[PDB]
């Protein structure tokens, strides 16, 4: 599930890096963190394996 | 090969059918400009459009809307804000003052031509020459005036309505005359050269036996009704034999412009398809997002000139992004959150993400109010705004049984116990009121209403019994203090809780 | 009563009999609705910890 | 009031009339204030005020105005109940095809104009344009390219027009007329072969006659305006935590509103022709998903990932009218508590916890406090019972005196699952249930929450006392066996009391009365081994019988004194060992000869007697209780040595089977038989008196909990475990549970037992499905007529296998009225009259002489127009009395057939019953012969011999042999459909009954034949109409149509004849007259469309119809009230005829 979240984050970073230039760019400014923690939250929030 | 999918079907039409217009954007823009030029040329002619635009412009300039409603301010100084507004206003006023006489002469010539066509005599003693001379001046004045599209829209609508009425009349005449051996395409050719004489159906029986039968007892009344409708519509708007070709050419120009716009849209829809991939899972389906961004794409072609950077790619992507963000902010939360509130919550979440990325742990909601330079109480109400209403059919256990909808309580359903106290409070009140005076009990009940739900005030219940004064309030206070003893108010002491 | 929850709300539906009873007893209609948490039917009894 | 609910196509004008405001914005409420929007899914002026008589903007929230509408908000002031009834409509910019009619099994939209759904689905999605008004350009050419649209249009630019999409399909439906199409199909169906085209022509003519007869226009499947469910149905209540909980339908309606607004904006904006048609396609897909959501791509909500349910998805699953909404209503006034044994209570008294009786009888407690004067007002009463004052407990015991409460066990498989009990305010918090009644409930006390219900009405409180009482549910509805028989403890006590041994103290010591036995037992002179003589009245002959000094025992006298005084019963029944089967026959004979009061009192006494004599007996299980056979090690060694002699040379499969069947499968009953023989022998002590009988042997012989298989598994050889495919294990497993099983043998045991455990949890699901199918196919089978005018009946023959009888003929025919008077063989003496009830005496007289099958009137031969008769169902299985009018005979039979489930079993037991009830063609379809005498050869080279007509693959007959009708070529598993097509209907019924009986006997659950007879009759409610004229329907049809159609044709003349067709229990709802009965458990997207386009109106004649509708059931007390209503209406009509 973290690999799925990382694939989503990679898609987001690929969609966002085309707009923001890489030369003189603020570090880690295009990498998102919502789908990273959202995947583990769903895994521990309402997953069938983490049900109880 | 049944796909059974709207998304796939939409993609197939765009791909297997539509071809990406490469380096043809500028050509489509030039075609749209040519269509607009054709529409303007058809509009500025001898008809009701030139008279309506001239008569409407006569009141403008001094006491009516002179700029921003008749002629575009940008189009005036485009070939040449406060200085440009007054400069174009004086020029438009001078043009109207110089073209008023030309418009009057053109209207007189049109009236004379309509009279000659309705009577039968052909006005050839320089009448047509004077009419053309008066119309050319008005056309040249309107073309160089660089008017706006506001009145142009109403003129095109009126022209389309008149053309639809004329087409309906012609179709009715063709259906009435083509019973035996007549056709529909010959009606226009007959009415173009046999419209001056009133007995058009009678003086057109040169050859053919079916024509006589269609004119006698077949369409003799239909042709008269059509001629009467045409004569009534000539005075209401533009005359006949001159507005027909004008509306035809303006409709052709509008059709060409619409075809160019549709071609540019279909040759760019792939763009919208490509842009609708980053907004997926934001409250709208993929095909829904595509067909919503199509609205913004069509709105972009309406304003697309030959400015710097003629590539329509950037403009199209900006407009699709604005249309998706304008629609995703509305049909995504199930509550129709406003667009500005959606952008505010997006700014708040972006600030929170940047703080988590750079500063560290999650900041307090009170800190986000000052981090964005906004009111502290406004940020407290921005969050907790029902971000996503959970589905009422979601599962509650390990299986898909007993969803959340079956466990939600009801805060409005009157419980049977609370109805029990209602019925008994209706019984316990009728018993306590049975000990009071009959008229006094009646007026007290009218003060609130046991059987009648119309709760009357003090004076309203006063008029029903005696003179509306403090006597009713006095008797009400006496009654209220009456049933306060342990004998009368015994079963009610445990009723108020 | 476990924790008294006082929740402000709007004016409840003014019924005639209830208004008459309130005027008789002189009290005023409480604008707040009772929402205090209560123990369900059981033999719970004692309270171990009350974290706020 | 209301009655006769009818459904049909929703007209756009009628849909607009239903609604109160057109919604044009997909906005439910505001983000700041939680109020409904102006025009959206949640509206005030469109669906009513959100508060009870509280208009918007606080203008008319005083309730003084009831019909006044607001000015700024425009919402009319009305209570919140109107917000759930007010509907809405969405006038779409373009039409949309209904998902139920477009995408389904029968393409109801494709049946119009004879166009397949594969092309109708393409013309709707704007893929292939359709041609209209042709005049080159053939009608329905289905062209997509613009060549024929524009290039081919260059013929004068006149008379060239075609449309595409939902509007095109709507215009196509409008063009086709019902009358002309039906007339054209009538001549196309008659006077022609109609080989392949008939299959579609029949459905098309049926749909056309439904549209024409019902009055629905053909162009109504596609709807321009979609009605919206009221906002109260799909709520948006604010959940705890500020997160709103919007219903699934709210998101679908929001999507539909968004699509409609987008289409309206595109049309008004003059969008490209490929985007507007694509917008119409998106709107059509959204409307499809909003109705069913299954036929489309399963559009998921934007927030959650679960498939969004729709108006069809709700009705399908349990969460709609199927289970959650209508049938399985979460009834209040109920209680669920763990149950405990109640042996101190009577059979008609269940223990009720004091903490639960208050919450259950709150209104009754309030009424008792108000009538008694203890509480002044209802609020004061609620304040009294809320604190559980000491003065309310005395009122609770007074209110619960004769008010029976329905005891509802978690799983119910028959009508005895809901039994009303006179509650007793027992201490604790557990329902003190009676031990004798929990066996009928299927509820042991190892943890079984028995949901308790309280009837509120005076009739329901009295209905639970006349029918739902435990005393009236003695005999189970499955067969004529009492279900109140002692299961485990009372049977063990009676067996210990009835076991007689020649060696014991007090041999032949004659006693005076019954009390003398106990007086001597308390003195230690006489034991309880039942070997002492005394006096007792048997009461065998007519009238009172003298107190004859019987040679019986003391132990059997304690049970004999509990037997009521009546002829044909007495100590003669207690003379046996008094096992579970014998004690059940004793409770059956006491009920069969004596009344129910004496039967229930004897059951109550024997339970207390068995309990008192079982605890004082000391039946504790011990190490020496399960005695391992001493002759076991030697036999195991000899078996394992014989398993090695033939294994030396070795075929391996033959040697294995010799070592697993003849080696371990054989001699495993030999060791078990030796163990049983060593356990049966009564060991005699040195003093000449036997020590005691083994407690495990007592439990096995009495039938309480033991058995031969369980005995062998516990102390015997344990048998051989199973495999995943079903094969028997070949390894030696020689160890009993009394001994230590090693790891491998116990692993094999848990490999063979987990299969049966899953069958108890997996096959039980099939049992529940079969029970659901049976009660919904037999719901209409309700006894209404006492005696019908029919004389023919089904023949009941005692089934026999080998050389012995499997079931006695006196038991199979018991409780059924005979059709013709049975004649005793040998001498022509009428042993039973023609049309009289078969009492137990008549059954005994019939079984006294060997007789063949007797003509018995059954529900199958019922000539009653509606429901089932009374003289055909025979005797109700509840008691010995005959069946009375109003009983749900079909529901009782369905429950009796579903009760053997969860313990049945492919074709083993449960799957075979499901296959026979559904009437499916088995894996080896058998073909009946129907030929008499010689049989010829079929056609030449047609891949099979279909049939040979001689009027005057694998084969089992010859080419010239004389074949007789009845012998059909098959290797087994015949087909009931072929049985009906070739053989009679009574023969198919007998075959089904014998098959079900053989299955239930192989499993061990005896079920009465009539319970299968009613199901078979309900499966035969359809008859194929072979009428050559006056009716073009050849497929199956309800019998009421030939009852009415065949009678109407005679008033105009062609004779009409129809052969009965048999359809499965699942297919009963496919052609049933009522749609609510069929749309309840069957698929809701096909029966509704089959009833909507047909205009099927529910007359509420069945049971499931009134249950869903909420009205009184037409069966039982509801049946009697319906009869009273009918007679009152007749009396009112007669009175009206008196005054002109
Ligand atoms: Mg149990
Ligand atoms: Zn209002
Ligand atoms: Zn009958």
From Swiss-Prot, chain C:
Q: How does it assemble?
A: The RNAP catalytic core consists of 2 alpha, 1 beta, 1 beta' and 1 omega subunit. When a sigma factor is associated with the core the holoenzyme is formed, which can initiate transcription.
Q: Which family does it belong to?
A: Belongs to the RNA polymerase beta chain family.
Instruction: Give the residues of the full protein shown.
Output: 888 to 939 of 1356
Looking at the record's lineage, which domain of life comes first? Bacteria
Q: What does this protein do?
A: DNA-dependent RNA polymerase catalyzes the transcription of DNA into RNA using the four ribonucleoside triphosphates as substrates.
Q: What is this protein called?
A: DNA-directed RNA polymerase subunit beta
């Amino acid at each position: 599930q973290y690999r799925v979240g990382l694939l989503r984050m990679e898609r987001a970073i690929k969609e966002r890096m085309s707009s923001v230039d890489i030369d003189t760019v603020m570090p880690h400014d295009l990498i998102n963190a919502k789908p990273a923690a959202a995947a583990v939250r769903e895994f521990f929030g309402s997953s069938q394996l983490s049900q109880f | 090969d049944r796909t059974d999918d709207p998304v796939r079907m939409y993609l197939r039409e765009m791909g297997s059918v539509e071809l990406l217009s490469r380096e043809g954007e500028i050509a489509i823009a030039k075609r749209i400009e040519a269509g607009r030029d054709t529409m303007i040329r058809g509009l500025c002619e001898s008809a009701l459009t030139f008279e309506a635009i001239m008569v409407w412009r006569e009141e403008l300039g001094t006491g009516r809307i002179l700029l921003r409603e008749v002629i575009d301010l940008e189009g005036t100084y485009a070939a040449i804000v406060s200085a440009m507004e007054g400069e174009l206003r004086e020029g438009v006023m001078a043009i109207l003052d110089a073209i008023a006489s030309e418009f009057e002469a053109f209207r007189k010539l049109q009236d004379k031509l309509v009279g000659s066509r309705l009577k039968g005599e052909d006005l050839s003693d320089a009448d047509r020459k004077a009419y053309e001379g008066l119309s050319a001046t008005i056309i040249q004045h309107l073309k160089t005036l660089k008017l706006n599209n506001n009145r142009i829209e109403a003129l095109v609508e009126q022209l389309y309505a008149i053309n639809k009425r004329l087409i309906g009349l012609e179709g009715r005449l063709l259906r009435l005359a083509d019973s035996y051996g007549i056709s529909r395409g010959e009606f226009l050719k007959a009415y173009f050269g046999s419209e001056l004489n009133p007995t058009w159906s009678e003086q057109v029986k040169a050859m053919g036996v079916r024509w006589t039968k269609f004119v006698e007892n077949d369409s003799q009344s239909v042709t008269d009704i059509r001629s009467e409708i045409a004569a009534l519509a000539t005075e209401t708007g533009v005359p006949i034999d001159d507005y027909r070709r004008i509306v035809q050419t303006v409709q052709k120009g509008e059709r060409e412009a619409r075809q160019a716009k549709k071609e540019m849209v279909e040759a760019n829809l792939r763009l919208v398809i490509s842009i609708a991939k980053k907004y997926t899972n934001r409250g709208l389906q993929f095909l829904d997002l595509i067909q919503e961004g199509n609205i913004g794409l069509m709105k972009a072609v309406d304003k697309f000139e030959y400015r710097r950077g003629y590539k329509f790619s950037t403009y199209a992507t900006w407009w699709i992004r604005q249309a998706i963000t304008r629609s995703i902010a509305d049909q995504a939360r199930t509550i129709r959150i406003p667009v500005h509130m959606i952008e505010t919550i997006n700014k708040i979440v972006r600030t929170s993400r940047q703080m988590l990325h750079e500063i560290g742990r999650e900041p307090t909601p009170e800190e986000l109010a000052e981090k964005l330079a906004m009111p502290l109480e406004k940020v407290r109400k921005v969050l907790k705004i029902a971000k996503e209403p959970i589905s009422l059919e979601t599962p509650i256990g390990d299986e898909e049984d007993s969803h959340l909808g079956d466990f939600i309580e009801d805060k409005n359903a009157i419980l049977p116990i609370d109805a029990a106290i209602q019925s008994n409070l209706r019984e316990t009140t009728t018993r306590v009121l049975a000990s009071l005076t009959p008229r006094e009990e009646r007026v007290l009940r009218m003060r609130f209403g046991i059987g009648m739900n119309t709760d009357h005030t003090l004076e309203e219940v006063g008029q029903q019994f005696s003179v509306t004064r403090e006597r009713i309030r006095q008797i009400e206070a006496k009654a209220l203090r009456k049933l306060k003893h342990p004998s009368r108010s015994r079963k009610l002491r445990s009723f108020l809780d | 009563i476990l924790v008294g929850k006082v929740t402000p709300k709007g004016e409840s539906p003014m019924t005639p009999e209830e208004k008459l009873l309130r005027a008789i007893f002189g009290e005023k209609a409480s604008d707040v609705r009772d929402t205090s948490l209560r123990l369900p039917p059981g033999v719970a009894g004692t309270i171990v910890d009350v974290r706020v | 009031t209301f009655d006769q609910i009818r459904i049909s196509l929703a007209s756009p004008e009628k849909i607009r009339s239903w609604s109160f405001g057109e919604i044009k914005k997909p906005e439910t409420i505001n983000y700041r204030t939680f109020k409904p929007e102006r025009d959206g899914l949640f509206c005030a002026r469109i669906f009513g005020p959100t508060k009870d008589y509280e208009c918007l903007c606080g203008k008319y929230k005083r309730m003084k105005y009831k019909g006044i509408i607001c000015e700024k908000c425009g919402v009319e002031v009305t209570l919140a109940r109107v917000r759930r009834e007010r509907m809405g409509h969405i006038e779409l910019a373009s039409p949309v095809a209904h998902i139920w009619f477009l995408k389904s099994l029968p393409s109801r939209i494709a049946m119009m104009l004879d166009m397949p759904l594969k092309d109708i689905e393409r013309v709707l999605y704007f893929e292939y344009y359709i041609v209209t008004e042709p005049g080159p350009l053939k009608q329905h050419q289905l062209l997509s390219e613009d060549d024929y649209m524009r290039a081919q249009e260059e013929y004068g630019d006149d008379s060239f027009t075609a449309e595409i999409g939902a509007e095109a399909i709507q215009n196509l439906l409008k063009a086709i007329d019902l009358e002309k199409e039906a007339e054209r199909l009538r001549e196309e169906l008659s006077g022609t072969v109609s080989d392949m085209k008939q299959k579609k022509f029949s459905k098309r003519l049926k749909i056309l006659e439904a549209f024409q007869e019902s009055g629905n226009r053909p162009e109504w499947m596609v709807l321009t305006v979609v009605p919206v469910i009221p906002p109260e149905l799909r709520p948006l209540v604010p959940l705890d935590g500020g997160r709103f909980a919007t219903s699934d339908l709210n998101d679908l309606y929001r999507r539909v509103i968004n699509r409609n607004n987008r289409l309206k904006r595109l049309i008004e904006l003059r969008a490209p022709d490929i985007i507007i048609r694509n917008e119409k396609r998106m709107l059509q897909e959204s409307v499809d998903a909003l109705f069913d959501n299954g036929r489309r791509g399963r559009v998921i909500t934007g927030a959650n990932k679960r498939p969004l349910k729709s108006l069809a998805d709700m009705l399908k699953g349990k969460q709609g009218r199927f289970r959650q909404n209508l049938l399985g209503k979460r009834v209040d006034y109920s209680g669920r508590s763990v149950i405990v044994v109640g042996p101190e209570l009577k059979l008609h008294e269940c223990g009720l916890p004091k903490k639960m009786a208050l919450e259950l009888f709150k209104p009754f407690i309030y009424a008792r406090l108000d009538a008694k004067g203890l509480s002044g007002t209802v609020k004061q009463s609620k304040r009294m019972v809320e604190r559980e004052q000491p003065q309310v407990w005395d009122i609770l015991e007074e209110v619960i005196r004769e008010h029976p409460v329905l005891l509802n066990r978690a799983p119910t498989l028959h009508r005895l699952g809901i039994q009303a009990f006179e509650p007793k305010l027992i201490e604790g918090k557990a329902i003190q249930l009676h031990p004798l009644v929990c066996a009928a409930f299927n509820a042991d006390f190892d943890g079984d929450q028995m949901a308790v219900h309280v009837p509120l009405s005076l009739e329901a409180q009295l209905e639970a006392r006349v029918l739902m009482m435990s005393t009236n549910n003695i005999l189970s509805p499955a067969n004529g066996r009492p279900i109140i028989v002692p299961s485990q403890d009372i049977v063990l006590g009676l067996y210990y009391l009835s076991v007689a041994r020649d060696g014991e103290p007090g041999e032949g010591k004659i006693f005076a009365d019954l009390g003398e036995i106990e007086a001597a037992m308390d003195a230690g002179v006489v034991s309880l081994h039942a070997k002492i003589k005394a006096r007792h009245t048997e009461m065998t002959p007519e009238g009172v019988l003298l107190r004859k000094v019987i040679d019986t025992t003391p132990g059997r006298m304690k049970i004999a004194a509990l037997l009521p005084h009546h002829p044909q019963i007495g100590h003669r029944l207690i003379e046996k060992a008094l096992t579970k089967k014998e004690i059940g026959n004793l409770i059956d004979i006491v009920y069969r000869h004596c009344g129910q009061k004496a039967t229930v009192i004897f059951a109550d006494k024997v339970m207390g007697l068995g309990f008192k004599e079982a605890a004082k007996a000391g039946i504790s299980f011990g190490k020496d209780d399960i005695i391992i056979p001493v002759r076991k090690t030697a036999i195991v060694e000899e078996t394992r040595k014989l398993a090695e002699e033939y294994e030396q040379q070795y075929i391996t499969k033959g040697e294995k089977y010799n070592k697993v069947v003849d080696a371990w499968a054989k001699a495993t009953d030999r060791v078990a038989d030796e163990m049983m023989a060593e356990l049966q022998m009564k060991h005699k002590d040195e003093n000449g008196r036997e020590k005691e009988i083994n407690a495990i042997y007592m439990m096995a012989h009495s039938g309480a909990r033991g058995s031969q298989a369980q005995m062998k598994q516990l102390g015997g050889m344990r048998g051989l475990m199973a495999k995943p495919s079903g094969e028997i294990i070949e390894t030696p497993i020689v160890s009993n549970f009394k001994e230590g099983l090693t790891v491998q043998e116990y692993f094999n045991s848990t490999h063979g037992a987990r299969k049966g455990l899953a069958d108890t949890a997996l096959k039980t699901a099939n049992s529940g499905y079969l029970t659901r199918r049976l009660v919904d196919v037999a719901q209409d089978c309700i006894i209404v007529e006492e005696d019908c005018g029919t004389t023919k009946g089904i023949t009941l023959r005692a089934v026999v296998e080998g050389g012995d009888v499997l079931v006695s003929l006196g038991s199979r025919v018991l409780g059924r009225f005979t059709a013709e008077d049975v004649k005793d063989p040998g001498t022509g003496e009428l042993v039973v009259p023609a049309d009289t009830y078969i009492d137990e005496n008549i059954a005994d007289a019939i079984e006294a002489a060997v007789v063949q099958s007797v003509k018995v009137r059954s529900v199958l031969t019922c000539e009653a127009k509606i429901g089932v008769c009374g003289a055909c169902y025979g005797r109700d299985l509840a008691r010995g009395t005959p069946v009375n009018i109003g009983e749900a005979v079909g529901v009782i039979a369905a429950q009796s057939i579903g009760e053997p489930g969860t313990q049945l079993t492919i074709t083993g037991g449960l799957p075979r019953v499901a296959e026979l009830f559904e009437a499916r063609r088995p894996k080896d379809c058998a073909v009946i012969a129907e030929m008499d005498g010689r049989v010829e050869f079929g056609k030449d080279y047609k891949n099979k011999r279909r049939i040979k007509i001689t009027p005057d693959k694998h084969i089992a007959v010859h080419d010239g042999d004389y074949i007789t009708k009845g012998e059909y070529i098959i290797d087994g598993n015949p087909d009931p459909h072929d049985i009906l097509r070739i053989l009679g209907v009574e023969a198919l019924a007998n075959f089904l009954v014998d098959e079900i009986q053989e299955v239930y006997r192989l499993q061990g659950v005896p079920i009465n034949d009539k319970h299968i007879e009613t199901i078979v009759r309900q499966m035969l409610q359809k008859v194929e109409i072979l009428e050559p004229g006056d009716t073009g329907l050849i497929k199956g049809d309800h019998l009421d149509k030939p009852e009415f159609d065949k009678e109407q044709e005679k008033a105009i003349a062609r004779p009409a004849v129809t052969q009965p067709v048999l359809l499965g229990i699942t297919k009963a709802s496919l052609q049933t007259k009522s749609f609510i009965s069929a749309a309840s458990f069957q698929e809701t997207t096909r029966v509704l469309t089959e009833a909507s386009v047909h205009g099927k109106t529910d007359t509420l004649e069945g049971l499931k119809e009134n249950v869903i509708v909420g009205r009184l059931i037409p069966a039982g007390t509801g049946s009697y009230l319906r009869s009273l209503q009918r007679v009152a209406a007749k009396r009112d009509e007669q009175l009206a005829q008196q005054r002109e």
